Amino acid sequence: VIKPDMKIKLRMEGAVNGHPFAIEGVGLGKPFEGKQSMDLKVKEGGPLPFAYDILTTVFNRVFAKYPENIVDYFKQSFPEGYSWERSMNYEDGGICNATNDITLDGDCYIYEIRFDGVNFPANGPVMQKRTVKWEPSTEKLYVRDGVLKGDVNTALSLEGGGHYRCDFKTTYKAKKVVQLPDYHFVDHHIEIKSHDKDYSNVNLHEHAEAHSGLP
């Protein structure tokens, strides 16, 4: 059911500071190597007046290399799939809520994504597009109330140097009951490899691997 090489299909509908937009994407990846890439196209609301970086971690933990000694919640959840919900709380009060309902059709994951950001100040690095990239990160995953939670405090590096912090709170929900993992981590590194001037086209990559921390 999960192949060494899978495809990605997605559409995001959303708004930032009340201004709506829509983006579609097509991609591919290797679930067992924890690598994926995709091409994203702004379909409505362009040119986006906010930093594209706030969207990229919304554009699937099945693309993560899990060692055998860590129960894999995400690969278990297919073919039925899973959904996830997330709050991304930035240190200047800007907050983005996002959801992704992930289904599987043949060799293609299909994402239905909603994205809603509020309270980004006009002079902040998001509305002024002063972000460079997400730093690499280490997400902490743990079970609560029969579902899987993922917490990570990460940051975006800024143009003049320095960092703009964001607290992630994700809830992962398999559509069918699967074996629940113990406390573990997922190392991430997400990168915009290329983009045109107004980010109408974005080539996005992510590399992720699970581990259990220092012994």
Binding-site residues, in ranges, read 195, 205, 207
- Supply the DSSP symbol for 125: T
- Binding residues with a second copy: total (CB under 8 A): 57
**Which position among 79, 165, 176, 198 is part of the footprint of a second copy (CB under 8 A)?**
165
Residue 189 lies near a second copy (rule: CB under 8 A): yes
The minimum distance between CB 202 and a second copy, in angstroms, equals 20
Residue bearing tokens 């950001």: 117
Pick the binder of a second copy from 22, 108, 155, 192 (CB under 8 A): 155
Check residue 209 for interaction with a second copy (CB under 8 A). yes
CB of 197 to a second copy, least distance (A): 27
Residue from 7, 30, 129, 140 that binds a second copy (CB under 8 A)?
Answer: 140
175 touching a second copy, by CB under 8 A: no
Query: What is the distance between the alpha carbons of residues 84 and 109, in angstroms, rounded to a whole number?
Result: 14
Bridge pairing between strands 108-118 and 6-16: parallel
Kindly identify the residues of this chain, within the stretch 106-125, that bind a second copy according to CB under 8 A. Answer: 114, 116-119, 121-123
Helix, coil or strand: residue 91: coil
- Does 180 bind a second copy (CB under 8 A)? Our answer is no
Closest CB to a second copy among 202 and 210? 210
Please write down the long-range contacts of 105-110, taking CB distance under 8 Å and 24 or more positions apart.
105/9, 107/3, 107/5, 107/6, 107/7, 108/6, 108/7, 108/8, 108/9, 109/6, 109/7, 109/8, 109/9, 109/60, 109/62, 110/9, 110/10
Q: Write out the residues near a second copy by the rule CB under 8 A.
A: 15, 17-18, 83, 85-87, 89, 93, 95-99, 101, 114, 116-119, 121-123, 135-138, 140, 142-145, 147, 151-155, 157, 162-163, 165, 167, 169, 171, 183, 185, 187-189, 207-209, 212-215
